[PDB]
Ligand binder design. Sequence first.
Ligand SMILES: Nc1ncnc2c1ncn2[C@@H]1O[C@H](COP(=O)(O)OP(=O)(O)NP(=O)(O)O)[C@@H](O)[C@H]1O
Ligand SMILES: [Cl-]
Ligand SMILES: [Cl-]
Ligand SMILES: [Cl-]
Length: 334
Amino acid sequence: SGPVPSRARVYTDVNTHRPREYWDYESHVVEWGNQDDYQLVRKLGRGKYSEVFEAINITNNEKVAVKILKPVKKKKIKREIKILENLRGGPNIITLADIVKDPVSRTPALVFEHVNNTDFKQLYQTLTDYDIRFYMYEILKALDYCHSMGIMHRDVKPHNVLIDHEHRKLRLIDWGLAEFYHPGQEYNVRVASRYFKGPELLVDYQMYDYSLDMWSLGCMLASMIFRKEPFFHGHDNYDQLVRIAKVLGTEDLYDYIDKYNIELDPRFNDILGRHSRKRWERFVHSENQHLVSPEALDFLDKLLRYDHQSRLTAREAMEHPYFYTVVKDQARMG
Ligand SMILES: Nc1ncnc2c1ncn2[C@@H]1O[C@H](COP(=O)(O)OP(=O)(O)NP(=O)(O)O)[C@@H](O)[C@H]1O
Ligand SMILES: [Cl-]
Ligand SMILES: [Cl-]
Ligand SMILES: [Cl-]
């Protein structure tokens, strides 16, 4: 009589229907490239698990990007490599062009297509309402694609979305926490960034699915339309669920837990208490009111729901009328 099972509403068996080797990434054998074929130009930044550099492919002088992984188990390296290989060709996902080793460290050096080192998080200040819709749809293409190829990103956040605003091109990056979805598998909840974690991770519900990403995307949307960064600003893991409950109310939270018979720390129950559902209009101010339309609020509602199985899928999100006009975009660069 543990917690109740769950299987994804969409793309449930896509990995099942594929050959083993599609998803059995521990078995993958990396083909190494020519390390003397890429020379680093300059440092573009970093992350908790990589150094990213602009570089050049010398055999044709083409511009690339090179992510040098810090040390770390080969299990994950093969997982990120296989995923990136599987997704190559998909809309708006970063293209893996080679893997080589760092000359001195001998660690893997992932060659990608070059983008601008400019992300969605940098552009929060300036985006018109049309542009928020537009880029949101571009991210959805990536999620729908990855989810349909059996893959959960599990780290959707503005830092992980590169935008070339000049060319109106977005790529979803940082697949290092991505995993393959298998109905009935339990996944670690130490995925994603505090502010973008679904209530499932926050209550240790491990039989989660692609719909985690859809919560994270809702959280990104909310910060952008309300100009509050982040939107749910939890100071620790438990406080993250308390902040969500202060907006979305506790009655549905407690209905979600008893839906899936999840075991919550009694003492943490006491901390949550009872919070009434705030109407999404509470966070409208003069400074953000031009970003907030009824279709925006309806879309967010359908994303920010405690029950992972209730949230819009990427495809259903793509059909939502928040994207009615922007799908007709006439592709003006300037
Ligand atoms: N293909 C790329 N083109 C340009 N910049 C990139 C590219 N990939 C990553 N970066 C840059 O790296 C900096 C930090 O990105 P980061 O999230 O570290 O990417 P990552 O290479 O996936 N690293 P990690 O988080 O360790 O996996 C940002 O300024 C990004 O612009
Ligand atoms: Cl971020
Ligand atoms: Cl995992
Ligand atoms: Cl989906």
